[PDB]
Amino acid sequence: LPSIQLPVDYNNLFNEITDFLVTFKQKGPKYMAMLQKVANRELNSVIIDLDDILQYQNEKFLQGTQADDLVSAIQQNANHFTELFCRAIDNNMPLPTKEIDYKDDVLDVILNQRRLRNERMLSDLFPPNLTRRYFLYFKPLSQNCARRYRKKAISSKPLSVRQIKGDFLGQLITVRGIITRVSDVKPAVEVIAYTCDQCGYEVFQEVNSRTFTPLSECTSEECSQNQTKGQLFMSTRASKFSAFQECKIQELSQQVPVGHIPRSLNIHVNGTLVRSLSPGDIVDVTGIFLPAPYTGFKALKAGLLTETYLEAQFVRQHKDVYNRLAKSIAPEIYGNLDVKKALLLLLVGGVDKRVGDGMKIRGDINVCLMGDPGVAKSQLLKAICKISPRGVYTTGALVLADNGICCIDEFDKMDESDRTAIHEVMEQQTISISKAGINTTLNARTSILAAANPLYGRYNPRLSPLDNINLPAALLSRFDILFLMLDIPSRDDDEKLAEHVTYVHMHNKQPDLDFTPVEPSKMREYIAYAKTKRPVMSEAVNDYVVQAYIRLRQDSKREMDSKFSFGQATPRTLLGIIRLSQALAKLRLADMVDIDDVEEALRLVRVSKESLYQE
Amino acid sequence: EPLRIIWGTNVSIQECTTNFRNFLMSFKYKFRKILDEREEFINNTTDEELYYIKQLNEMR
DNA sequence: TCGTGCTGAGTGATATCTGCTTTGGGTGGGTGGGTGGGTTGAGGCAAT
DNA sequence: AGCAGATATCACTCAGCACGA
Ligand SMILES: Nc1ncnc2c1ncn2[C@@H]1O[C@H](COP(=O)(O)OP(=O)(O)OP(=O)(O)O)[C@@H](O)[C@H]1O
Ligand SMILES: [Mg+2]
Ligand SMILES: [Zn+2]
């Protein structure tokens, strides 16, 4: 074990840490107050701000009593400084100011009795981590503070998984990425307490590894002296445990080089930081990059190759009304007012579903878009899915869409099994799993947004609407509203479309200037408010709806006498009409359903299909 | 005398045994009713009759 | 027939040294098994 | 590193006798 002479003196650094804890001010000292709070059981986590250390160093240098660079020493090797800071805190822990029930704690009684036994023996001891009731974390050095004092902040500089090499091991670094996996919280053992059946004494063991060998034989003075062979038995009541969570962080798309596959890095979370990371959130995890040595035969067989993980220390989390909302849904596309209004109605989905007789009318205003290629079906899908809080985008996921709209693209190309799945979702609003492995049933009251293409790829006027649609007629009937979109050539419309697209391409902004789009945040919170609202309908509006229903039924029968009609009106069309009226009433923020809402719903129903079919 | 204590605490096993025996021997649901702030629902027969004694008799 | 050694080899016993083997993965094999794990991708076959 | 088998060197029990009481 040859020795080296390194330019670090841990005694001076410990004195520096103690002075910083005792004297630093930013009232009394900040960290002294924090320790006072910890003593009274008010705080269970202490965070050391490297900015405070840098400021203290600057003040000491200004005063002329230049001291060692503590920030750099902490950054270069943080594992030792955690223990150093813990020792410094322990040596200066203030006496509690609020009386507490000491006898309640098992550890207090056990240590008091150990003291009594030791006093008796003398008349004829425990690890410091055992009694610690706090956790220590390091907050990285802020870039602003470092630039103020003319210093480089390595710890707070974001890095990708690739940029974390072997030369960064043992340092305090930050990682930017997206969490892809988080495990369940489990107890990690740090100190193990044993008992002697014969002796009556308590033994302790410190665990700092993946694995440990339990004790078997008593080591007490009494046992040794008396020659009594006493067996040691584990006691989980007096042991010390810390919450443990293992997470995976993956590279962002913009960080991967050309022609490379993303990489992932493990993260270890201990103490009160648990539950601070969830899948799908982009985070700036600051921690100590450390290796994870193997043990036993694995150690010998592995070789010099070492695994690595990150000890989490800090986590930074990254971030006329109808017409206006419709136009602001997707400004980039050419004006399609009716489709946008239908999308609003689907999104809000207002309904009163409280029949209570055994079933309840479906509470989802499902929308299906079918049209020849060229219309911006993908753009509507993506925009409406982005705005929705529970919107899920899939290509021909339902669980994530529960109690929310489902954004399904390439609906016609979907396999028959998924067709049956969505059929169950609509008719029953339930998700059922019947497998040997597991059998779970999850309710799914989720709306569906469907985009499909005709059988021949483009709509054929000669063929009937049903012929152009590959899906079963029952599925089409179950859809509350069906919108048919077509691309009819025309000089004026084509010229405006070309001008709009060209302006968007050039200036990277919306060409329209007649009106200013409403802010998306306002629109989404208004939608949430409308959803929270509950409307109500009277008997007169019920009779009006009945009259509209008989008129629509007669008209639809007459139309279906010919082959042009999509399908005959059915009580399902009724229920859809009332659902749309309830959604519009929710929009209006007025409890009573008005005749205007019913008329608007009827005109929307007419223009969804007939307006384009007649053309 | 040997004095039995639960490991890691200062609670006497004899005290717990006698307390539980006293609770089982003499207890009425009216105490629960008053505790739950439902004192005005108290009847005169069931709430004034021993509960766990009846439970033990039925169990036997 | 009690007490105190001296003799003693027998009958232990317990404090003390000598050789596997393992993880899991083909840097142990298919005369250890496939119900102890691995295990997603390509390929050929029969019922459809 | 840990575990199971084994060697060999460590004491302890009943065995019995000489003196005297
Ligand atoms: N009204 C429009 N204004 C501007 N661009 C449009 C418009 N409609 C369609 N586009 C453009 O059409 C391009 C291709 O069409 P898009 O993917 O949006 O839908 P689609 O033709 O229905 O799709 P699919 O080919 O998958 O059936 C998109 O890049 C979009 O920019
Ligand atoms: Mg598309
Ligand atoms: Zn012991």
Q: Is A444 annotated as a binding residue?
A: no
Scored b (16 or more CB within 10 A) or e, A400-421 reads: ebbebbbbbbbbbebeeeebeb
Residue nearest to atom 14 of ligand 1 (CA): A374
Structural contact between residues A194 and A241, judged by C-beta atoms closer than 8 angstroms: no
- The number of angstroms, rounded, from the C-alpha of A592 to the middle of its chain's C-alpha atoms is 38
Distance from CA of B24 to the nearest CA of A (A): 26
**Separation in Å, CA A532 to CA A460, A536, B52:** 43, 14, 49
* Token representation of residue A4: 């080296």
Q: Are strands A264-270 and A202-206 parallel, antiparallel or unpaired?
A: unpaired
A450: nearest Cα among A474, A419, A429: A419
Q: For a substitution probing ligand 1, which of A379, A493, A497 has the most ligand atoms within 8 Å of its CB?
A: A379
A227 touches strand D (CB under 7 A): no
Q: A195 and B8 in contact by Cβ < 8 A?
A: no
CA triplet A287, A292, A294: central angle to 5 degrees?
A: 170
CB of A238 less than 8 A from some CB of B: yes
Structural contact between residues A586 and A530, judged by C-beta atoms closer than 8 angstroms: yes
State chain A's maximal CA–CA distance in angstroms.
112
| Dist CA A121 CA A139 (whole Å) | 46
CA triplet A343, A346, A347: central angle to 5 degrees?
A: 85
| Dist CA A565 CA A225 (whole Å) | 102
CB of A98 less than 8 A from some CB of B: no
- Pick from A104, A107, A108, A109 the residue to mutate for testing the B interface (most B CBs within 10 Å): A109
Interface of A with B in 104-163 (CB under 8 A): 106, 109-110
**Cβ-proximal residues to A407 (8 Å cutoff; 6+ apart), any chain:** A381, A382, A384, A385, A388, A391, A392, A393, A394, A449
| Dist CA A113 CA B7 (whole Å) | 11
Place of tokens 């240590």: A111
Radius of gyration of chain A (CA): 35
Helix (H, G, I), strand (E, B) or coil at A305: coil
Q: Are strands A447-452 and A307-317 parallel, antiparallel or unpaired?
A: unpaired
Tally the residues of chain B.
60
- The runs of H, that is alpha helices, within A508-594 are 520-532, 539-560, 571-588
A293 touches strand D (CB under 7 A): no
Helix (H, G, I), strand (E, B) or coil at A11: helix
Other Cβ atoms within 10 Å of A283 Cβ, number? 21
* Token representation of residue A539: 């008997």
Place of tokens 């021909």: A396
* Token representation of residue A203: 């033994």
Distance from CA of B7 to the nearest CA of A (A): 9
Structural contact between residues A198 and A230, judged by C-beta atoms closer than 8 angstroms: yes
| Option in A109, A195, A235 nearest B9 (CB) | A109
Q: A237 and B9 in contact by Cβ < 8 A?
A: no
**Cβ-proximal residues to A190 (8 Å cutoff; 6+ apart), any chain:** A129, A206, A207, A240, A241, A242
| Dist CA A509 CA A507 (whole Å) | 5
Q: Is A378 annotated as a binding residue?
A: yes
| Dist CA A385 CA A391 (whole Å) | 5
Beta bridge partners of A188: A242
| Dist CA A54 CA A33 (whole Å) | 20
* Token representation of residue B14: 């004899």
Q: Is A157 annotated as a binding residue?
A: no
Q: Which ligand is nearest to the CA of A194?
A: 3
> Which technique was used to obtain these atomic coordinates?
cryo-EM
E strand or H helix at A55, and its extent? helix A50-63
| Dist CA A276 CA A12 (whole Å) | 36
Spacing, Cα A375 to ligand 1 middle (Å): 5
CB half-sphere exposure, A544, CA atoms < 13 A: 17
Residue nearest to atom 19 of ligand 1 (CA): A376
Q: Which ligand is nearest to the CA of A499?
A: 1
| Dist CA A104 CA A108 (whole Å) | 8
Ligand 1 pocket member A375 (CB < 6 A):
yes
